[PDB]
Coordinates of C-alpha atoms and ligand atoms in Angstrom, one line a residue:
Chain M
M5 CA 0.0 0.0 0.0
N6 CA 1.2 3.5 -0.9
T7 CA 0.7 7.0 0.4
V8 CA 0.2 10.5 -1.0
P9 CA 1.1 13.0 1.8
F10 CA 0.1 16.6 1.9
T11 CA 2.4 19.3 3.2
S12 CA -0.7 21.1 4.6
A13 CA -4.2 22.1 3.8
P14 CA -4.4 25.9 3.9
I15 CA -7.7 26.3 2.1
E16 CA -11.0 24.5 2.7
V17 CA -11.4 21.9 -0.1
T18 CA -13.3 18.8 -1.0
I19 CA -10.7 16.2 -1.8
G20 CA -11.5 13.2 -4.0
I21 CA -9.5 10.0 -4.3
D22 CA -11.0 7.8 -7.0
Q23 CA -14.7 7.4 -6.3
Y24 CA -14.3 8.6 -2.6
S25 CA -14.4 12.1 -1.3
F26 CA -14.1 14.0 2.0
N27 CA -14.1 17.6 3.1
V28 CA -11.0 19.3 4.7
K29 CA -11.5 22.5 6.6
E30 CA -9.3 25.7 6.3
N31 CA -6.0 25.0 8.0
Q32 CA -7.1 21.6 9.3
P33 CA -4.2 19.3 10.3
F34 CA -4.6 17.1 7.3
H35 CA -1.5 15.4 5.8
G36 CA -2.7 13.1 3.1
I37 CA -4.1 9.7 2.0
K38 CA -2.7 6.3 3.0
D39 CA -3.4 2.7 2.1
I40 CA -3.8 3.4 -1.6
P41 CA -4.2 0.1 -3.5
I42 CA -1.2 -0.8 -5.6
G43 CA -2.0 -2.1 -9.0
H44 CA -4.3 0.6 -10.4
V45 CA -4.0 4.1 -11.6
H46 CA -5.6 6.6 -9.3
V47 CA -6.9 10.2 -9.4
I48 CA -6.7 12.7 -6.6
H49 CA -9.0 15.6 -7.2
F50 CA -10.0 18.9 -5.7
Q51 CA -12.9 21.4 -5.5
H52 CA -12.3 24.5 -3.5
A53 CA -14.9 25.4 -0.9
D54 CA -14.8 29.1 -1.7
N55 CA -14.7 28.7 -5.4
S56 CA -16.3 25.6 -7.0
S57 CA -15.0 26.9 -10.3
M58 CA -12.3 24.5 -11.7
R59 CA -12.6 21.1 -10.4
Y60 CA -9.0 19.9 -11.0
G61 CA -6.9 16.8 -10.2
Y62 CA -4.0 14.5 -10.9
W63 CA -3.8 11.0 -12.4
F64 CA -0.9 9.0 -10.9
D65 CA 0.4 5.5 -10.3
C66 CA 2.3 5.0 -7.0
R67 CA 4.4 2.3 -8.8
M68 CA 6.1 5.1 -10.8
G69 CA 7.3 7.4 -8.0
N70 CA 6.7 9.0 -4.7
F71 CA 4.1 11.8 -5.1
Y72 CA 2.9 14.4 -2.6
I73 CA 0.5 17.4 -2.6
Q74 CA 1.5 21.0 -1.7
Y75 CA -0.7 24.1 -1.9
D76 CA 0.8 26.9 -4.0
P77 CA -0.5 30.3 -2.8
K78 CA 0.6 32.1 -6.0
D79 CA -1.2 29.8 -8.5
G80 CA -4.0 29.1 -5.9
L81 CA -4.1 25.4 -6.2
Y82 CA -3.0 22.1 -4.7
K83 CA -0.1 20.8 -6.8
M84 CA 1.2 17.3 -7.2
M85 CA 4.9 17.0 -7.0
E86 CA 7.4 14.1 -7.1
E87 CA 9.9 13.5 -4.2
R88 CA 13.1 12.0 -5.6
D89 CA 14.7 11.5 -2.1
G90 CA 13.2 8.2 -1.1
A91 CA 14.5 8.3 2.5
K92 CA 13.2 11.8 3.0
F93 CA 9.8 10.6 1.7
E94 CA 9.5 7.5 3.9
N95 CA 10.4 9.5 7.0
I96 CA 7.8 12.2 6.3
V97 CA 5.1 9.7 5.7
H98 CA 6.0 7.7 8.8
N99 CA 5.8 10.8 11.0
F100 CA 2.4 11.7 9.6
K101 CA 1.1 8.1 10.0
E102 CA 2.4 8.0 13.5
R103 CA 0.5 11.2 14.3
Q104 CA -2.6 9.7 12.5
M105 CA -3.0 12.8 10.3
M106 CA -3.9 10.8 7.1
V107 CA -7.2 9.4 5.9
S108 CA -7.2 5.8 4.8
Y109 CA -8.3 4.9 1.3
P110 CA -11.6 3.4 2.3
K111 CA -11.8 0.3 0.2
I112 CA -14.3 -2.4 1.1
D113 CA -12.9 -5.8 0.5
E114 CA -15.8 -7.2 -1.5
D115 CA -15.7 -4.1 -3.7
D116 CA -14.2 -4.2 -7.2
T117 CA -15.7 -0.9 -8.3
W118 CA -12.4 0.9 -9.0
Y119 CA -10.9 -2.1 -10.8
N120 CA -14.1 -2.3 -12.9
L121 CA -13.8 1.4 -13.9
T122 CA -10.0 1.4 -14.6
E123 CA -9.4 -2.2 -15.9
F124 CA -8.0 -0.9 -19.2
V125 CA -6.6 2.4 -18.0
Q126 CA -2.7 2.7 -18.0
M127 CA -0.6 5.6 -16.9
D128 CA 1.5 5.5 -20.1
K129 CA -1.6 6.0 -22.2
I130 CA -2.9 8.8 -20.0
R131 CA 0.5 10.6 -20.5
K132 CA -0.1 10.6 -24.2
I133 CA -3.6 12.0 -23.9
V134 CA -2.3 14.6 -21.4
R135 CA 1.1 15.9 -22.6
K136 CA 3.4 17.2 -19.9
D137 CA 6.4 14.9 -20.2
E138 CA 8.5 16.3 -17.3
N139 CA 6.0 14.8 -14.8
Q140 CA 5.0 11.2 -14.2
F141 CA 1.5 12.2 -13.2
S142 CA -1.1 14.1 -15.3
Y143 CA -3.1 17.2 -14.5
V144 CA -6.7 17.4 -15.7
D145 CA -9.4 20.0 -14.9
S146 CA -13.0 20.9 -15.8
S147 CA -12.2 23.5 -18.5
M148 CA -9.5 21.7 -20.6
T149 CA -10.6 21.3 -24.2
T150 CA -9.9 18.4 -26.5
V151 CA -7.9 18.5 -29.7
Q152 CA -11.2 17.9 -31.6
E153 CA -12.9 20.7 -29.7
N154 CA -10.0 23.0 -30.7
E155 CA -10.3 22.1 -34.4
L156 CA -14.0 23.4 -34.3
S161 CA -7.1 27.2 -27.9
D162 CA -3.7 26.6 -26.1
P163 CA -2.5 23.3 -27.5
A164 CA -0.2 22.6 -24.5
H165 CA -3.2 22.4 -22.1
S166 CA -5.4 20.1 -24.3
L167 CA -6.8 16.6 -24.0
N168 CA -5.3 14.7 -27.0
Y169 CA -8.1 12.1 -27.3
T170 CA -8.3 10.2 -30.5
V171 CA -10.5 12.2 -33.0
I172 CA -13.7 10.4 -34.0
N173 CA -15.8 12.0 -36.7
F174 CA -18.5 10.0 -38.5
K175 CA -18.7 12.5 -41.4
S176 CA -15.0 12.6 -42.2
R177 CA -12.8 11.1 -44.9
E178 CA -11.2 8.9 -42.3
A179 CA -14.5 7.3 -41.5
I180 CA -15.8 6.9 -45.0
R181 CA -14.0 5.0 -47.8
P182 CA -14.5 6.6 -51.2
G183 CA -17.0 4.4 -53.1
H184 CA -18.4 3.0 -49.8
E185 CA -20.3 6.1 -48.7
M186 CA -23.6 4.5 -47.8
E187 CA -22.1 1.3 -46.5
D188 CA -19.6 3.0 -44.2
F189 CA -22.0 5.7 -42.9
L190 CA -24.7 3.2 -42.0
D191 CA -22.3 0.5 -40.8
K192 CA -19.3 1.9 -39.0
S193 CA -17.4 -1.5 -38.9
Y194 CA -14.7 -0.4 -41.3
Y195 CA -14.0 2.7 -39.2
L196 CA -14.1 0.7 -35.9
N197 CA -12.1 -2.3 -36.9
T198 CA -9.7 -1.2 -39.6
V199 CA -9.1 2.5 -38.9
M200 CA -9.4 2.6 -35.1
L201 CA -8.7 -0.8 -33.7
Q202 CA -6.1 -2.2 -36.2
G203 CA -4.7 1.2 -37.2
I204 CA -4.7 3.6 -34.3
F205 CA -5.3 1.8 -31.0
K206 CA -3.7 -1.5 -32.1
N207 CA -6.1 -3.5 -29.8
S208 CA -9.4 -3.3 -28.0
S209 CA -7.7 -2.9 -24.6
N210 CA -6.2 0.5 -25.6
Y211 CA -9.6 1.6 -27.1
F212 CA -11.4 0.6 -23.9
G213 CA -8.7 2.4 -21.8
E214 CA -9.3 5.7 -23.5
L215 CA -13.1 5.2 -23.3
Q216 CA -12.8 4.5 -19.5
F217 CA -10.4 7.5 -19.0
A218 CA -12.8 9.8 -20.9
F219 CA -15.7 8.7 -18.7
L220 CA -13.7 9.3 -15.5
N221 CA -12.7 12.8 -16.6
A222 CA -16.3 13.6 -17.5
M223 CA -17.5 12.3 -14.1
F224 CA -14.8 13.6 -11.8
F225 CA -14.2 17.0 -13.4
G226 CA -17.4 17.7 -15.3
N227 CA -15.1 17.9 -18.4
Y228 CA -17.5 18.3 -21.3
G229 CA -15.1 17.3 -24.1
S230 CA -14.4 14.1 -22.2
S231 CA -18.1 13.3 -22.1
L232 CA -18.3 13.9 -25.9
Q233 CA -15.4 11.5 -26.4
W234 CA -16.9 8.8 -24.1
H235 CA -20.2 8.9 -26.0
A236 CA -18.5 8.9 -29.4
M237 CA -16.5 5.8 -28.5
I238 CA -19.6 4.0 -27.4
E239 CA -21.5 5.1 -30.5
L240 CA -18.8 3.9 -32.8
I241 CA -19.0 0.3 -31.4
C242 CA -22.8 0.2 -31.2
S243 CA -23.1 1.5 -34.8
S244 CA -20.9 -1.3 -36.1
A245 CA -22.5 -4.4 -37.4
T246 CA -19.3 -6.5 -37.0
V247 CA -17.7 -6.3 -33.6
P248 CA -15.8 -9.2 -32.0
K249 CA -18.0 -11.0 -29.5
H250 CA -15.5 -10.6 -26.7
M251 CA -15.5 -6.8 -27.3
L252 CA -19.3 -6.5 -26.9
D253 CA -19.3 -8.6 -23.7
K254 CA -16.6 -6.5 -22.3
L255 CA -18.3 -3.2 -23.3
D256 CA -21.4 -4.3 -21.5
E257 CA -19.4 -4.8 -18.3
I258 CA -17.6 -1.5 -18.7
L259 CA -20.7 0.5 -19.3
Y260 CA -22.7 -1.3 -16.5
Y261 CA -20.1 -0.2 -13.9
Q262 CA -19.9 3.3 -15.3
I263 CA -23.7 3.7 -15.1
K264 CA -23.7 2.2 -11.6
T265 CA -21.1 4.6 -10.3
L266 CA -22.6 7.8 -11.9
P267 CA -24.2 10.1 -9.4
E268 CA -27.9 9.9 -9.8
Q269 CA -28.2 13.7 -9.7
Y270 CA -25.7 14.2 -12.5
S271 CA -27.5 12.1 -15.1
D272 CA -29.1 15.1 -16.9
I273 CA -25.6 16.5 -17.7
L274 CA -23.5 13.3 -18.1
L275 CA -25.8 11.2 -20.3
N276 CA -26.6 12.0 -23.9
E277 CA -30.2 10.9 -24.6
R278 CA -29.7 10.5 -28.4
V279 CA -26.6 8.3 -28.1
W280 CA -28.1 6.0 -25.4
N281 CA -31.5 5.6 -27.0
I282 CA -29.8 4.8 -30.3
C283 CA -27.3 2.4 -28.7
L284 CA -29.7 0.5 -26.6
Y285 CA -32.8 0.4 -28.8
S286 CA -31.9 1.1 -32.5
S287 CA -28.3 0.1 -33.1
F288 CA -26.8 -3.0 -34.5
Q289 CA -25.9 -3.9 -31.0
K290 CA -29.2 -3.1 -29.3
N291 CA -29.4 -6.7 -28.1
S292 CA -25.8 -7.0 -27.0
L293 CA -25.8 -4.8 -23.9
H294 CA -28.1 -6.7 -21.6
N295 CA -26.6 -5.7 -18.3
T296 CA -26.2 -2.0 -19.3
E297 CA -29.8 -1.9 -20.7
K298 CA -31.1 -3.3 -17.4
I299 CA -29.3 -0.9 -15.1
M300 CA -30.1 2.1 -17.4
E301 CA -33.8 1.2 -17.5
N302 CA -34.0 0.7 -13.7
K303 CA -31.9 3.7 -12.7
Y304 CA -32.6 6.3 -15.4
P305 CA -35.9 5.3 -17.1
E306 CA -36.6 9.0 -17.8
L307 CA -33.6 9.3 -20.2
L308 CA -35.4 6.7 -22.2
Chain H
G1 CA -27.6 27.3 -42.9
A2 CA -31.2 26.9 -44.1
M3 CA -32.7 28.8 -47.0
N4 CA -36.1 30.6 -46.4
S5 CA -38.1 33.7 -47.3
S6 CA -35.7 36.0 -45.5
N7 CA -32.8 35.1 -47.8
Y8 CA -34.8 34.5 -51.0
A9 CA -32.9 36.9 -53.2
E10 CA -29.8 34.9 -52.5
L11 CA -31.0 32.4 -55.1
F12 CA -30.5 35.0 -57.9
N13 CA -27.1 36.3 -57.0
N14 CA -23.9 35.4 -58.9
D15 CA -22.8 32.5 -56.6
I16 CA -23.5 29.3 -58.5
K17 CA -26.1 27.1 -56.7
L18 CA -28.2 24.1 -57.4
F19 CA -31.5 22.9 -56.0
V20 CA -31.7 19.1 -55.7
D21 CA -35.1 17.4 -55.4
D22 CA -35.2 13.6 -54.9
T23 CA -39.0 13.1 -54.7
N24 CA -39.2 11.4 -58.2
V25 CA -36.1 9.2 -57.9
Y26 CA -37.9 6.1 -56.5
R27 CA -41.4 5.8 -58.0
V28 CA -43.7 2.8 -57.6
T29 CA -47.1 1.6 -58.4
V30 CA -48.8 -0.6 -55.7
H31 CA -51.0 -3.5 -56.7
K32 CA -52.5 -6.7 -55.4
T33 CA -50.9 -10.0 -56.2
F34 CA -52.6 -13.2 -57.3
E35 CA -52.4 -14.5 -53.7
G36 CA -54.0 -11.3 -52.4
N37 CA -50.9 -9.7 -51.1
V38 CA -49.6 -6.3 -52.2
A39 CA -46.5 -5.7 -54.3
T40 CA -44.8 -2.7 -55.7
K41 CA -43.6 -2.2 -59.2
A42 CA -41.0 0.5 -59.8
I43 CA -41.1 2.8 -62.8
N44 CA -38.4 5.1 -64.1
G45 CA -37.6 8.1 -62.0
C46 CA -35.4 11.2 -62.1
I47 CA -33.3 13.5 -60.1
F48 CA -34.3 17.2 -60.5
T49 CA -31.1 19.3 -60.2
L50 CA -31.8 22.9 -61.1
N51 CA -29.8 26.2 -61.3
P52 CA -32.4 28.8 -60.3
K53 CA -30.4 31.7 -61.7
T54 CA -29.9 30.3 -65.2
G55 CA -32.7 27.7 -65.6
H56 CA -30.3 24.9 -66.4
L57 CA -31.8 21.6 -65.3
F58 CA -29.6 18.4 -65.1
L59 CA -32.3 15.7 -65.1
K60 CA -30.6 12.4 -64.3
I61 CA -33.0 9.6 -65.4
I62 CA -33.1 6.8 -62.8
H63 CA -33.8 3.6 -64.7
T64 CA -35.7 0.8 -62.9
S65 CA -32.7 -1.5 -63.3
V66 CA -30.8 0.3 -60.6
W67 CA -33.2 -1.1 -58.0
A68 CA -32.9 -4.7 -59.2
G69 CA -32.0 -7.0 -56.3
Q70 CA -31.6 -4.1 -53.9
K71 CA -33.1 -3.8 -50.4
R72 CA -34.5 -0.8 -48.5
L73 CA -35.1 1.1 -51.7
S74 CA -36.4 4.3 -50.2
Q75 CA -33.2 4.6 -48.2
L76 CA -31.0 3.6 -51.1
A77 CA -32.7 6.2 -53.3
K78 CA -31.3 9.0 -51.2
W79 CA -27.8 7.6 -51.4
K80 CA -28.1 7.0 -55.2
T81 CA -29.3 10.6 -55.5
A82 CA -26.3 11.9 -53.5
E83 CA -24.0 9.5 -55.5
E84 CA -25.3 11.0 -58.9
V85 CA -25.3 14.7 -57.7
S86 CA -21.6 14.3 -56.4
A87 CA -20.4 12.8 -59.8
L88 CA -22.3 15.6 -61.6
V89 CA -20.4 18.2 -59.4
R90 CA -17.1 16.2 -60.0
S91 CA -17.7 16.1 -63.8
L92 CA -18.5 19.9 -64.0
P93 CA -15.5 22.2 -64.8
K94 CA -14.2 24.0 -61.7
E95 CA -15.6 27.4 -62.6
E96 CA -19.1 25.7 -63.1
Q97 CA -19.2 23.8 -59.9
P98 CA -21.7 25.1 -57.4
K99 CA -20.8 26.9 -54.2
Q100 CA -24.0 25.7 -52.5
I101 CA -26.4 22.8 -53.0
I102 CA -29.8 23.2 -51.6
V103 CA -31.8 20.0 -50.9
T104 CA -35.6 20.2 -50.9
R105 CA -35.9 17.4 -48.3
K106 CA -33.8 17.3 -45.1
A107 CA -33.3 13.5 -45.4
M108 CA -30.9 14.3 -48.2
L109 CA -28.5 16.3 -46.1
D110 CA -26.4 13.4 -44.6
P111 CA -26.2 11.4 -47.8
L112 CA -25.1 14.4 -49.8
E113 CA -22.7 15.6 -47.2
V114 CA -21.0 12.2 -47.0
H115 CA -20.7 12.0 -50.8
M116 CA -19.3 15.5 -51.0
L117 CA -16.6 15.1 -48.4
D118 CA -14.1 15.8 -51.2
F119 CA -15.7 19.3 -51.6
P120 CA -15.5 20.9 -48.1
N121 CA -16.1 24.3 -49.6
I122 CA -19.5 23.4 -51.2
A123 CA -22.2 24.2 -48.6
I124 CA -25.0 21.6 -48.4
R125 CA -28.1 23.4 -47.1
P126 CA -31.8 22.6 -46.4
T127 CA -34.6 25.0 -47.2
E128 CA -37.7 26.1 -45.4
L129 CA -39.4 26.8 -48.8
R130 CA -42.0 24.3 -49.9
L131 CA -41.1 23.9 -53.5
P132 CA -43.2 22.1 -55.9
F133 CA -40.5 20.3 -57.8
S134 CA -42.2 17.0 -57.5
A135 CA -44.6 18.2 -60.2
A136 CA -41.7 18.2 -62.8
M137 CA -43.1 14.9 -64.1
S138 CA -46.3 16.9 -65.1
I139 CA -44.2 18.7 -67.7
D140 CA -45.0 16.5 -70.7
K141 CA -41.5 16.6 -72.4
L142 CA -39.8 15.7 -69.1
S143 CA -42.2 12.9 -68.3
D144 CA -41.8 11.5 -71.8
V145 CA -38.0 11.3 -71.7
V146 CA -38.1 9.6 -68.3
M147 CA -40.6 7.0 -69.3
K148 CA -39.0 6.2 -72.6
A149 CA -35.6 5.6 -71.1
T150 CA -34.2 2.1 -71.4
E151 CA -31.0 2.8 -69.5
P152 CA -29.5 5.5 -67.2
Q153 CA -29.3 8.8 -69.1
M154 CA -28.5 12.4 -68.2
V155 CA -30.8 14.9 -70.1
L156 CA -30.1 18.6 -70.2
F157 CA -32.9 21.3 -70.4
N158 CA -33.5 25.0 -69.7
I159 CA -36.6 25.0 -67.6
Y160 CA -37.2 28.7 -68.3
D161 CA -37.2 28.3 -72.1
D162 CA -36.3 31.8 -73.4
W163 CA -37.9 33.8 -70.6
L164 CA -34.7 35.3 -69.3
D165 CA -34.5 37.3 -72.6
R166 CA -37.4 39.3 -71.2
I167 CA -37.6 38.8 -67.4
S168 CA -35.2 38.5 -64.5
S169 CA -34.3 35.2 -62.8
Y170 CA -36.3 36.2 -59.7
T171 CA -39.4 36.5 -61.9
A172 CA -38.7 33.4 -63.9
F173 CA -38.3 31.3 -60.7
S174 CA -41.5 32.8 -59.4
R175 CA -43.3 31.9 -62.7
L176 CA -41.9 28.4 -62.6
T177 CA -42.9 27.7 -59.0
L178 CA -46.4 29.1 -59.7
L179 CA -46.8 26.8 -62.7
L180 CA -45.4 23.8 -60.9
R181 CA -47.6 24.5 -57.8
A182 CA -50.7 24.7 -60.1
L183 CA -49.8 21.4 -61.9
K184 CA -49.2 19.8 -58.4
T185 CA -52.6 21.0 -57.1
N186 CA -54.8 20.3 -60.1
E187 CA -52.8 18.9 -63.0
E188 CA -55.7 18.5 -65.4
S189 CA -56.9 22.1 -65.0
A190 CA -53.4 23.5 -65.1
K191 CA -52.7 21.8 -68.5
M192 CA -56.1 23.0 -69.7
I193 CA -55.0 26.6 -68.9
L194 CA -51.7 26.2 -70.6
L195 CA -53.0 24.6 -73.9
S196 CA -56.7 25.7 -74.1
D197 CA -55.9 28.2 -76.9
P198 CA -54.6 26.2 -79.9
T199 CA -52.9 29.2 -81.6
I200 CA -50.2 29.3 -78.9
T201 CA -47.8 26.5 -79.4
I202 CA -44.8 24.9 -77.6
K203 CA -41.7 25.3 -79.7
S204 CA -39.8 22.0 -80.5
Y205 CA -36.9 23.3 -78.4
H206 CA -39.1 24.5 -75.5
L207 CA -41.0 23.1 -72.6
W208 CA -43.8 25.7 -72.2
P209 CA -45.9 27.6 -74.7
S210 CA -44.8 30.7 -76.5
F211 CA -46.8 33.3 -74.6
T212 CA -46.5 37.0 -75.1
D213 CA -45.8 39.2 -72.1
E214 CA -49.5 40.1 -71.8
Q215 CA -50.6 36.4 -72.2
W216 CA -48.2 35.3 -69.4
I217 CA -50.0 37.8 -67.1
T218 CA -53.3 36.2 -68.0
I219 CA -51.9 32.7 -67.6
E220 CA -50.4 33.5 -64.2
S221 CA -53.7 35.0 -63.0
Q222 CA -55.5 31.8 -64.1
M223 CA -52.9 29.7 -62.3
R224 CA -53.4 31.7 -59.1
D225 CA -57.2 31.4 -59.5
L226 CA -56.8 27.6 -59.9
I227 CA -54.7 27.3 -56.7
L228 CA -57.2 29.5 -54.7
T229 CA -60.1 27.6 -56.2
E230 CA -58.6 24.2 -55.1
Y231 CA -57.8 25.6 -51.7
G232 CA -61.5 26.5 -51.4
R233 CA -62.6 23.1 -52.6
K234 CA -60.2 21.4 -50.1
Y235 CA -61.1 23.3 -46.9
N236 CA -64.7 24.1 -47.8
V237 CA -64.1 27.9 -47.9
Ligands
LIG1 C1 -22.2 11.7 -64.1 C2 -22.9 12.6 -65.1 C3 -23.1 11.8 -66.5 C4 -24.0 10.7 -66.2 O1 -24.9 10.9 -65.4 O2 -23.8 9.6 -66.8 C5 -22.2 13.9 -65.3 C6 -22.7 14.9 -66.3 O3 -23.8 14.7 -66.8 N1 -21.9 16.0 -66.5 C7 -22.3 17.2 -67.2 N2 -21.6 18.2 -67.4 C8 -22.3 19.2 -68.1 C9 -23.6 18.9 -68.4 S1 -24.0 17.3 -67.8

């Protein structure tokens, strides 16, 4: 188990760690998060009490380094940093643990939720979507735009998701206009899976990362990307059976985890009604269809 | 964006544009079968592609053989229309290619957009105008070439005959849409109006009769009366 210590907590803030969250008061003796499960990426995220503008956060993997949080009063945010001195880092954490000034990652043992939401998400792929090569961890916030959003403006602060556009030359083979527009299998299997992502695991990783950024930061371009990646699969007549079964599992846990009161802004009615009831794969998403119908029957 | 009454004069400016109407592409008769089921039989159709400034009409005849062995014909017909309109645009010299293509039915937008990806600077637009181009097959010479076709054929026509020698494009389009609306509303009566007088003839090289300026005024009034008459018959007014 690994640890992300905090130098201090000078401003009141709601802190998230994966799907968990807790409130820290202004100048409260809080010094971080312990017992973080090794083996997964994680996200530590913030929303300031005095300014809910900019949810922001950091994706990280404790296997890649020792990371801590320190508030910057000039830039006005909690920054992640890497400590390269291992002995210094261990000694700091030990003191904070001994004084019981850290919250424990509150994982229930029966509970696979975080694994189910991040099964395909790897840090190395996050660092290609979020480009800041001098850090081993990746900053995301509520306002960052995607490369596709920018094409339709600071490129260094962008989310480089894979561009999906159903009315583009990439999606449509000359001479196969109707075929490729009504059946996106070419675009899914040849252009995207064989060509760009190389395999379905990388495709699902980006889909899962997009969802998590949409959910945790309210990042609108991330929501667009998540829905586009769902729609591309569902609008394909030819999808490997293992991929459809895995998509059903991925979407089921995403819908299960979504806050009930964010469904109006995080779920696109058109995409979901099309995917569940009209698409080639309308009968391939049994678990997702059941949870959607029982939890959000209004959207449908 | 969409084309409506607010930007109606844009049709007659010097930016090349084409209307595309797909109503008459897929045409069928419906009949009972020996077993008492119902079956369709396709008949030849056409794409109606019109330059409203010049009157040039690219009427692509759609021969029934293109439907043979195909499924979902009403959907296929939109894609065939887009396929045919895009090769017409590809075939046209650069300085003749349109800057805008206006489709009369919004279901043509995506098929045409996808077929025209290679032409990102040609705007594909809907219209809020209710245009009566479905009645093109009430023009005898157009109906005749479509029904006589034995293979796909592109036929060229000026739908304004020689009117632009005497009137503006705005007026010619208004006359055309009035004639087509009248033929759409009561075809028999419209043709009666257009031919009633045997001394006015259709030139071999024209579609409509050779009316004088004064006679066109009379004809246009009679067409308006027909449309109003039929509206009264319809709604009991
Ligand atoms: C594809 C089409 C020919 C066909 O439909 O077989 C193209 C065409 O008719 N080009 C023209 N350029 C000037 C006047 S008509």
